[PDB]
Structure formats: C-alpha cells, structure tokens
Symmetry: D2
Subunit: 304 residues, 4 copies
C-alpha cells in the first residue's frame, strides 16, 4: 500500500447552478436543489509508483504537498459549473490527473454539509429565507470516485458510489423480533411489538457512471429520494427484523430507479429498553437508552 492525501477539506460555495429537471417518485416530493449554499467536505488520496522514493529516500521532488491539494480542491469548487457532488468529484479528479502526470490513481470522497431553510417575515408575509440557513447535523449525502491514468495517458473512472449517511429512524410500533435461536447463549426475550430504532447508511451504484453527474438530471438518483423511500418502506412494513426491513428498502429503491445496479446497506440497531409496559388509560409506554453494544447488518441488493 502506498497512498497519501488530505482529509477534512471543507469547502462552501454560494450560488452553485441549481439542480432541476429531476424525475420524481411517489415516495418523495423532492424536485431539485436551490444551491444558494453548497457545502462539501472532501478527502483526496493519490498514488503512483513514482512516489516510492518520497518514502524510501526522503526525496520530495515529486511530492504534491497535501496543503496544495487542499488549495486545488477549494479553487476547483469556485470554477465548477455543474450541479452535483458526484460531478464535482469527477471535475477535481480529471483536473488533478491532467495537472500531475506522475500520479497514477486518485480517490475522492465528498460528504455533503447540509443546510436547512428557515422562516422569515418580510413585506407582509412569512416565507422561507433566501439568506439564512440552518446547519444540520443529521443525515447527509455522500459521493465516492476513483480514477486512474492508463499507460496511454487516458483517464478512466474505476469505481463510483453515491450515498446517504447518518439517517436515524425510530418506528414506535409495528415491528417484531421473534423466532430467533434460543439456546444457552440467549437471554433476549421474543418481542411482538418493539420500537425499532435503526441507523442507516445507504449506498448506491449506477449502471452508467454518467448518470451520477447530473448532466442529464432526469437520470440522477437523489439522496433525498432515497431517504424518503426508506421512511416509507419502514412505515409500510410490519418488520420482522432489521435484515427483513433493509432488503425491502433495497428492493423498492431498485424498483424506483432502474438505472441503478445495486444498493448497499450498513444498518445498526439502537432500539430502546422498555421500562414501563402499561400506562393506565393510555397506549403509551416508557423506554430508555440501552447499554452500548449495538447490532449491525451489512447487506447488498442487486438488480439481479
């Protein structure tokens, strides 16, 4: 292994070209992105056999300073004329390999820094502000791209993946976990109605990488729409386990987006412990935080 790079390259751009012309799905009102504020946290990794002596000999002649990579990324956000994080990464990657001919491979991660709208009164009505936004620490979109330089100096994308990270959903009823193995290691009671709390990280891969860029936006798959599929399927489903749930979410995603090749889930179980089961004259209960150990699932659904 031989790579080096720069992480936590925060970059905030105002007035990026808006994303419009997307194709809708029943589960989601998503219709585009205004891009008054477009925030991204980028990580860049680069490799190439010509870098060996920077490790073995202390020779920095072919070292692009990691600080310079930060400058590169931030200056390219200013010149980017596209509309997606996925497209931004392609722009940075192609540009970097063109600039630095001794680099053979580049890997990029971009994570959305999401902002929400806020209310303001002006001119007699209350409406969403075009100026004031709220920083969100909830779920966020992600993108990943790897690009290589070939022997003939052409550049190729070798892997692309988009995602939604940090979605935390609790369904208060309509979930069971029963029928699992009861042996000398089992102390978990069967539960026919639990308040399932899942953390979800959902990643998708396109059949055609061009569709990830937003250039023909009707082919773009938006993290917002993926979120809304997840919440809809969770609601609709009498869940039998998290495994059961995430397969159903993945199937719905692939049905709604035939341009996707596969969808990958990282889920965690954070369901609360029950403290009070019955409340007089109420359907309510009281729960509390569990001990730290958490269940998790890793699972891919493919169009095949």
């Amino acid at each position: 292994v031989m790579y080096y790079g720069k992480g936590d390259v925060f970059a905030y751009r105002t007035y990026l070209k808006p994303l419009t012309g997307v194709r809708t799905i029943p589960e989601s009102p998503f219709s585009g992105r205004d891009h008054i504020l477009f925030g991204v946290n980028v990580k860049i990794s680069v490799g190439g056999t010509k870098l060996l002596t920077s490790f073995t000999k202390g020779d920095n002649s072919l070292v692009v300073a990691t600080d310079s990579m930060k400058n590169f990324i931030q200056k390219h956000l200013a010149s980017y004329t596209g509309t997606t994080i996925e497209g931004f990464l392609e722009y940075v990657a192609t540009s970097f390999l063109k600039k630095y001919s001794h680099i053979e491979k580049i890997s990029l991660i971009g994570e959305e820094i999401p902002f929400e709208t806020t209310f303001a009164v002006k001119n007699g009505n209350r409406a969403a502000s075009e100026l004031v936004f709220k920083k969100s620490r909830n779920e966020y979109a992600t993108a990943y791209l790897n690009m290589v330089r070939n022997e003939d100096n052409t550049l190729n994308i070798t892997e692309q993946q988009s995602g939604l990270a940090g979605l935390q959903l609790i369904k208060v009823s309509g979930n069971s976990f029963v029928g699992f193995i009861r042996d000398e290691y089992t102390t978990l009671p069967e539960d026919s109605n639990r308040p399932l709390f899942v953390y979800l990280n959902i990643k998708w891969k396109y059949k055609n990488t061009e569709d990830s860029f937003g250039t023909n936006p009707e082919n773009y798959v938006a993290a917002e729409q993926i979120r809304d599929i997840a919440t809809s399927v969770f609601h609709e489903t009498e869940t039998l386990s998290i495994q059961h749930l995430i397969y159903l979410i993945g199937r719905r995603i692939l049905e709604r987006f035939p341009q996707l090749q596969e969808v990958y889930f990282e889920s965690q179980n954070h369901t609360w412990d029950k403290i009070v089961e019955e409340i007089p004259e109420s359907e309510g209960k009281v729960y509390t935080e569990p001990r730290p150990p958490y269940g998790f699932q890793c699972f891919t659904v493919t169009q095949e």
Copy 2:
C-alpha cells in the same frame, strides 16, 4: 457545596397528551405538539444538611441511591398527565421532595430529545407518518427548575428557566463587521459583507412560573417560536455584529411574549474564512472552516 444526583437519565414516552391551544406569533407557524414520541434527558441534583455524614462518615442511612433517582424519574414520566418538559420537571420535583423529607433542595434539567416527521405512502397518498420518526441532532428545547423545602414543609420553586440550545444559523450576505478597534493587536480586516455563522443558546424566564407549565397553554412560550423569531430577525437585519443581532432578537422575543421577564443569549461566532472572493459570471464565493478559536457573547435583555 454539597449536592449529588444522576445525569443522562434518558426517558422516552409515547403518546403524551398533545400540546394545543397555544397563541401564535407572526414569525412562526407553530401551533402545538403531537407528542406521539416525547423524549427527554434529565439531570437531577439534590441537597440537604442531613446529607453531611454520607460524606464525612460514610453513613449511607439517608442516601437515596442515584440509581433510585433514575427509577423515580422514569416512572414519573409514565404517570405524568401534562404536556410540557417544564411541567414534567415540576411534577418530578414536587413528588421527590414529598417522598424524601430530609432533602431540602432539588435542581432539575430537562433537555428535549427531538424527533422529526417523515414521509410515507399509504392508501394512495403520501403523508407524514404517525409511526416513523427521525432522530434530530440539531437544536433542542431545554428546561430548568429548582425547588426547596421550607421550615414549615411547604415547597417553593426558587428558579425556573426555559431554553433553546444548539441553534446553528448562517446568513450568507447582509452582515458587516467594521469600525472595531484597530491597534497593535488587530489583524482582522474590516468586512462589509461577511457570511455570519452563529451558534445560539437562547434562554427565557417567565414573569409567572405557572405560565411555563402548559396548564393554560395560551401563556406558554414555545422553543419552536423562539427559533423562528431568531431566524426572522437574522434575515431582516443588516447585522453590524453578533452583539447587535442578539439584542434585536431579544427585543423581538420580549415584544412578542409580554409574559416573559427576560431573555438570555449565549452566542458563538463560527464564520468561515474566505478563499475565493470573485467567481466569473456569478455572485458566488468559496469559503472554508476557520482555525478553532471562536468568539462568544453572553447577554441579557429584560422587559425593563
């Protein structure tokens, strides 16, 4: 000083009585709370001279175990028939002093664990789910209460405060910071148009503590409404500093809510560093995260 207690007492209640009948303000659509899910993180502190020997002699005869306080809090959330965190704290406090006659003082903090609604398709339309909610790590409501037992065994509230914590707002334009002291310690340039980014913690105190409880809900001041005042005033104001902004927010709060005695602000400055000032054929710019040192302000506005 002599106190002991329990922190991080998480408690989640389903189907609390809903909060309705509130009085509206222009800056906010807030009209109540459904309370399908009501989450609170409670901290309890207790004191009393009768506790001295638990420290000086190792005598636990009068020690309520901190673990038992956790049970007390969680069981009282199940029996609580009110509609606010402020009212819950009063219920816990009164109940605890009634149970434990050698305790002279109790202090409670309750912090909302907020959940947001999600979309689901069912029966032919998409609508907000009554079952699936999204855990939010953004701003949250707070409450504080201190209660004492007097010589005649009556109980009195000695301080009450409500709040909104963790509000993070960025206004992209329409802010200046100019005209400050320029001396041998000054390297900050004057800026006539900066993207001010503030973190805000806003706390209010009522003229009449009864108004905090929700029993006559038209007198309750909701953290949601306070949030919306903050965003509205930020939008409306050509800010001259954070100090300037927070005074204006506080004045608007006291004007909208004449039942409040005062409002207290803890603000922090997290404004980004500018990297690209001019983008061809655009009003956009690029910014990045600053170094760690952050400005802060602490400021009270009173009805007087």
Copy 3:
C-alpha cells in the same frame, strides 16, 4: 449579564522557563516541569458598562475584536517570563486591563494541553528531550477573575486551580451498602465493587500569590493532587464516592496547609458485573452500564 470574549485560544510555547524548586510530597515524585513544551487552551471573557452600545446600537467603536483578544493572548505567551498557567493568567489579565481602560472586568480560564515523555535509545534507553506524546487524559486548569476598582486599582476577585478528567478504577476494596430501600430502589447492595470514578478536583489558595509560582515552595501542582487522589483511593476501604472524595480532600488540605479549600466534581461509571465467579480464579467479568451516571459535588475547607 453582558460580556463577550474568545474561546479555544490554543497556544503552544517551547522552552518556557522551567518550574523548579517545588516542595515534593510523599505521595508524588513531582519536583517541577521542564517546560520544553508548554501548551495551554485559553478562554477570555470581558465586561464593562461602556460596552452597552455595542449591543444596543451596533456601535463597534469600543469593541476590541475577539480575534484581537486571540492575538493578545498568543503574543503574551511569547513574552511571559514566569512558570505557571496561573501566573500566565495573571499576566494576561493585568496587561489587558492596563491596555483597555474601558474594560472593568476580565475572566480567564487556562487548560493545560498535556504532553508526556517518551523513550529513545541513544546506546541506553532514556527519556527524549525532543519527542513527546499528546495525552487526552487528565489535565491541569486555572481560573482567574480580575476587576478595575473605582479608584483605578486592579484586584483579583476569584482564583481557582484544578485537575480535570482524572478517571480512576479500583478493582476491589469498595462497598456501597446501607442506602435507602423503598419502592424506587432496585440497586443491590455490593460489599466489593470495582468503583470507577471520574474526578475534577479544584483548589483555592489562602494567598492568591502562592498560585503564581514566584515562590515555588508554596505552589500546589496538579500532578501532586492526582497522586494524592490515587494514594487515598488505594488506602481507603471506600464506603461511597461521597466518603472517598471527603478523605481525598482531607489529605490534600493536610499536605498543603497554604490551601483554603478543595472542591470536587465526581461521577460514578462503575461497570455492571456479568460473571460473578470464574473457576479457580479471583477474577470476574464486567461490562459497560447504561448511560445514566451518578455524580457528587462537595467542598472541603481547611
């Protein structure tokens, strides 16, 4: 309330004047600080009635920029000729009030950023004078409040030193029994628990000048306080955290008669026991509890 300031002012200085000549105590090997690397995280807050219109009118005429406060602190760390965080806070506070006549009050917090020695071979193995390890464990703290009086004199109104983030577990020799059992009590009595405490310990001096280090025989080092706490924890068959922190405070006040008080903020993080008995062993297995934690706050006075 009306103040403003700057937080997370990190400042790292190399080769501060060494802290030497400290009175050593039985519990601790501490005898000074080399100060090859001196790291502090400073928070400054200032007030004055003349600041009112910066809030009420947007008038920045009398605003020292918080960014400039950052520069002030970092440049004063470069010119500081003393040997403690406590003395550094006094230097900053006096300098700031002397510079800015419209400021009536200043409050400072300084938190050590601690670095530990590491081994190098140079031959034989010894502590390096160049390579240090950044520690995210316990750290020293200092607090100072200073005011300008009506007669233009300056006065320290509050001073407090401390040790923060000490996390100690004693595997045996601790009990928690005899507490109230009623409808809300589910906790079992335990005659031998592995008490795990977090400790924040703060102390005040009878004479504020003893905090500065200028006469090092009267300086109380956070390193010595740590080693008193572990020594007392070891020696004591504890009956509660309450019981332990009282005895730690008594020992501190006995070792350091120049101190007026010691204040504790403790938390309980004791593990849940999962396996009570292991064939042919003294040992047991435990695991992390649910999040709710007990805490205690207590002052011992000289």
Copy 4:
C-alpha cells in the same frame, strides 16, 4: 455483501493469566502484562449463504441474535485461559464456528481498553495493585478472519495486530522542503518544524500462531512498537512523514524478524507558527491549524 453482527461489546476481566516471558528489546522496558485488569472492546461479524432468507423472507430460524453474540463473547472472556487479545479472538472464533454449523465466516476486531498504573504510599511510594487510571491515549488492536472450508475444517484467512491512536510531536529536528511549487502551492518550505503525527501501526506475522502468545518469545507487543516509533522519531532528522514512517517500519522489521509486514496510517497535525523569535530564548509560539489534515498510508514488508 451479506453479514451481520454486534459492535461495542465491552468486556472487562480481572486477573487474566499474566503475560510473561516476552522477549525484551532495547527500545522498550516492556516485559509482560500483569493483567490485573484486562479490558477489550469486541466487534463480531458473521456470514454464511444459509443466512439469506433472514434478509429475503424475514425468517429468523437461523438467526443467532446479535444480543446472543454479545453474551457469547462475554462468557468466553470468563473461560479464556490464554494471555492476549489475539489469542482471545482465536478462541471466540473457533468456538463460534464449532457451535454454529450454518456460519461459514467470522470476523473479529478486539480493541484494548488501556489502564495505567498509579502511585500509592504504603511508607514508601509504589505502584498500586488495585487502583488504575483509564487512558484515552493509544491502544492495542487485533483482527482475525476465520472460515469453514468445504471439508468442514476451519482456517484463519487473515490476522493483523496493531497500535492505534499514538499522537507524537517532535519539537525540532524535522524538515519539509523540496516539494512541488506551482500555481497551487502556498505552503512555505520549513527546515525546522515541530512535526506532530498521529500514528496507527499494524503488523502481520509470518506464522499466525506467534500472535497468540502461547510461546511468548515470539509475541510482538504493541507497547514495544510504540517505543520503537518514539525512538526512531527521536533519532531521525525527518524529511517528511513519509520518510519517518518508512524508517519506523524498517526498525520494527529488524527488531521482529518473525513479522511479515508493517502497515502505517499517519496524519499530519503540525501547528502553525505564530511567533518566530523570542528575546533571549530558543523557543517559539504556535497554535492549532485549520481542520484539513494530511495523511499517509504505507506498507513495509520484511
């Protein structure tokens, strides 16, 4: 991809069999572990084609509950008769595959929860056998993957030990010069910087059984790796982080010929210099940089 499991399985055992008889090296005083307190945080992941219908149909018939995996790990820590996290992972993995015939693959991570000795007076000052300090600094790690073959035999396919979270700063004797200067370069060359690195160091054995501790002469302790890194950092006039980690890896492989490779994940956290020159002193003042950090990933092979 199809697996599931349990993370943050904390398990604390008292009086594990001590690790003794380790080969000591010049760079490190390490000679074993008392194991009065042994803490590990375990993550388990399992797979098998027979798990498919638990996803596709909601059939829990063949689901070992993740909660039960937690119980499995904690109870096996109570019955473990060995002396390392690496050997504990092997015990859990073999036991789990022997118990659950429908599981084809298991992957384990174990992370040390480290505890440091403290002083007590008992008389004279000495290390306590009862009171320990929880450390949030560097910690040992272990990784193991085991599979069931077509012929029902079990095989370790992957094993890796490590040291995580080592944060080291060298105040002088580091340079970063000679790198590419073009339209995107603003970083100044620096012939004497206080290089601050975070290090995660991982190693693989030629023979997986040397990882278990069963013959302690062949065991490579994370404590020894730490002290090699600080020793090499001290000795080296570094020319980059790249240059440093290569030399640390070379030294590790020379000291431990039983190792097949060492892998590094490094990050740069060097401070920004604020004051270049201090009257009549060697010293300087620095402060924390903006968030973006450099990193390096590199493998050295025996």
